[PDB]
Amino acid sequence: KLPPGPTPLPVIGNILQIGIKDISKSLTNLSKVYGPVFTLYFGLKPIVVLHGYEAVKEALIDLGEEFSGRGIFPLAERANRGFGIVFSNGKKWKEIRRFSLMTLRNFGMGKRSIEDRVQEEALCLVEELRKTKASPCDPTFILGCAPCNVICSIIFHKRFDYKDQQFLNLMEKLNENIKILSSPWIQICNNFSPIIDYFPGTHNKLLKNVAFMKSYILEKVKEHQESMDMNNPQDFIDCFLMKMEKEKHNQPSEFTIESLENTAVDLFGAGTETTSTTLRYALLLLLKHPEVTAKVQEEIERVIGRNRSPCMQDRSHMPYTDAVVHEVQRYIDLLPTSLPHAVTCDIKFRNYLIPKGTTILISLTSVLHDNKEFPNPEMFDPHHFLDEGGNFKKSKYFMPFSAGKRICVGEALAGMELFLFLTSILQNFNLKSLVDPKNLDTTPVVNGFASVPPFYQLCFIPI
Ligand code: HEM
Ligand SMILES: CCCCc1nc(Cl)c(CO)n1Cc1ccc(-c2ccccc2-c2nn[nH]n2)cc1
Ligand SMILES: CCCCc1nc(Cl)c(CO)n1Cc1ccc(-c2ccccc2-c2nn[nH]n2)cc1
Ligand SMILES: OC[C@H]1O[C@](O)(CO)[C@@H](O)[C@@H]1O
Ligand SMILES: [K+]
CATH class of the missing domain: 3.30.43.20 (Uridine Diphospho-n-acetylenolpyruvylglucosamine Reductase; domain 2)
Known part of the structure; x- marks a missing residue:
């Protein structure tokens, strides 16, 4: 049965x-x-x-x-x-996932570490936030650029300047697609029709946007084929090409230029929006709970100070911050x-x-939102990840990245981005709401299989 x-x-x-x-x-x-x-x-x-x-x-x-x-x-x-990692199955999935995990280790792509790439993006992020000159601002676009550029750095080896038109196009396409993909007509209702596609226009637009992305990726792969240093792979593409030139005596292979383009489209898809949304939601929660923000800043100032970037190494000395990030992820679901x-x-x-x-x-x-593991699971409260002594308390119930064999490939990367971007922001700014903090609503707007924060603005006041 x-x-x-x-x-x-x-x-x-x-x-x-x-x-x-x-x-x-x-x-x-x-x-x-x-x-x-x-x-x-x-x-x-x-x-x-x-x-x-x-x-x-x-x-x-x-x-x-x-x-x-x-x-x-x-x-x-x-x-x-179904041709990358996210939606693939069997051998294609096992192989591409395995490779992607190896490649995405902190030092799995040459000397330059993933943490270095994120740290550089965090300095850039802080700079754009200065350029707002403390005026009201919807952080959506700024916070979305940082994770998008991290993936760019991982795949192409080099970040883009936030004004480089080639970056603004990639980002715009991605946004479009993700917003389309968020519609319940596209996620649910059109799947009621097993054969006939009732939104053929919409899918056409999706595919056109993909093709733009894939075609830009092809331009880069070429450039990478003409400057290949077999001893010094610097990014995800190099690593993929070396995997190919290692499989040539084993066709048909799961590793081909076509699976490279599809895998990279997956990483942009999976790696941007969720991180972006989590960051945006984090700042909203910090606005609403200024005591929380202050405790994070106390950790920052004491463990890190002002004369240098926040690095992962700090995270084990900053349990309260660790708890705040964990709790953001748990609460917003x-x-x-x-x-x-x-x-x-x-x-x-x-x-x-x-x-x-x-x-x-x-x-x-x-x-x-287990109400025994996390008493009052509906409330944002960093104590859900703190013991009575103020140390970090792990939870087997912390699964915002899912669990098991299909656990988010970006778990560690998203973890660095969240910790370094949040710490770097609160190292350099205080947060001021336009409206009264007591008037902000942080309850999540659900629409189908997706949660999202409500709209809000804030000011980034330099310290
Ligand atoms: C806070 C940000 C993120 C969250 C909450 C998140 C969460 C998830 C979740 C829940 C899944 C589905 C797991 C399942 O099928 O059961 C997933 C899949 C995935 N995520 Fe993430 N993710 C995040 C960021 C990233 C980033 C930055 C990357 C970049 C490498 C990434 C890459 C992936 C990939 C490739 C998959 C598909 C894994 C597979 O099906 O085998 N994610 N993510
Ligand atoms: C028909 C083939 C053309 C495909 C296409 N490529 C792009 Cl680019 C555009 C921009 O709208 N489009 C057209 C397009 C037209 C309507 C939609 C749409 C918007 C809201 C609700 C339903 C639809 C839809 N899609 N298909 N039929 N109706 C989406 C894309
Ligand atoms: C310009 C290209 C934008 C990205 C994109 N457009 C489309 Cl169409 C595809 C289909 O895979 N993709 C790739 C993609 C792969 C995985 C996701 C995804 C990853 C983790 C969790 C949820 C999603 C998801 N599925 N639908 N919307 N968002 C989103 C987009
Ligand atoms: O497998 C049975 C089929 O019936 C449908 O529900 C039609 O609603 C499809 O979604 C499914 O593929
Ligand atoms: K149409």
Whole structure:
């Protein structure tokens, strides 16, 4: 048997029960009726939902290889998304992921470290924030540039100047695509149609934007082929090309110029928006909780001071800051259902039998907002990651990057970006709201499978 669920209607399954508006809350409501493991029907396609820590851990961690598949919907083929890391499966995924992890280690791309790349972006970020000259400002665009340029640095070896038109084009395309991809028409409703694409225009626009990106990446690969130093790979492209020229006696290979372009599009896609949104949300929460900000600044001033950049090494001496970043991620819950999984083979889970390829939906909300691990889980409070002594308290329930075999490839990178960008900002600025802090609402705007902060402005007042 599959896990029990609400009985589907004919030809529409469970669609009309589920509140598309806030899918996570519906899943949670269902869990109160059917328990931690239950089945929903998306017009005949069964979806098993895992809710709560135990179920999620059992599946993602203890039965990891079996739950390592990526769930497929029509959108995957309509936006040509299954050829990188994020939406790939089997051998293509294993190989590209493995390689990408090796390449993305702090020193996996020559002498220049990933941390160096992030540190340079943090100085640039601070500078743009000075240029606002302490006036009101929607930080959206500035905070989005920093992570985008980090990926640029990782892939092409060199960051762009924030005004370089080639950068502004990449960024604009990416924004467009992500905003389109956020629409419930594109994420949900159009997947109800298994064969006919009811938004052919939209997908065309998506693909055109991709092609622009892929074509820019091709220009660079060429440049990288004409300046290849086999002993000194400096970026993700070099590393990929060396992997190719190491596989030439083994075709057909998962490593080709085409998988390089698709993998890089994945890294831009995965690596920008979520980090950007997390940073923006962090500043909103810091505005609203100025005591919190002050405690971070106390750590900064005491451990780091003013005569130098904040580096990772600092993080182990700054538990309060570490707790603040962790708590931002836990509270805001940007991917409440992760990305969909799928079982790779027939598998007995608990006392249910789940057939190979069945889509699994993991509720990360249920873990991050566990009300016993994180009492008052609905409140932002850095103490959720602090012991009674004021030290950092780890949580097995801290899964904003998901868990198991499909855990975010950028976990460590996003971790550096968040810590270095936040510390560098509060090293150099205080934060002043336009409106009254008591009047700001930090509660998240959900629209489908995606959380987002509300709109706000602030002033970056130099110290
Ligand atoms: C705070 C920022 C980020 C968050 C919260 C985040 C979170 C996630 C989550 C939840 C997943 C899905 C895991 C799953 O399928 O179960 C994921 C996948 C991924 N993330 Fe991130 N991510 C972030 C930043 C980044 C960055 C900076 C990169 C850049 C390398 C990146 C690369 C990826 C990739 C490649 C995947 C696909 C992994 C796979 O399916 O095998 N992410 N991320
Ligand atoms: C039809 C093939 C042309 C594809 C295309 N490439 C780009 Cl670039 C544009 C800019 O709008 N477009 C057109 C486009 C037209 C309508 C939409 C759209 C916007 C809101 C709601 C539904 C649609 C839609 N897409 N397809 N049909 N209707 C999106 C892109
Ligand atoms: C100009 C190119 C912009 C990026 C982009 N446009 C499209 Cl279309 C693709 C499809 O993969 N992509 C790549 C992409 C890959 C993964 C994601 C992603 C990664 C982690 C978590 C959620 C997402 C997601 N899926 N849909 N929207 N955002 C977003 C975009
Ligand atoms: O597999 C059964 C098929 O039925 C559909 O739900 C149609 O709603 C598709 O999403 C799925 O592919
Ligand atoms: K049209």
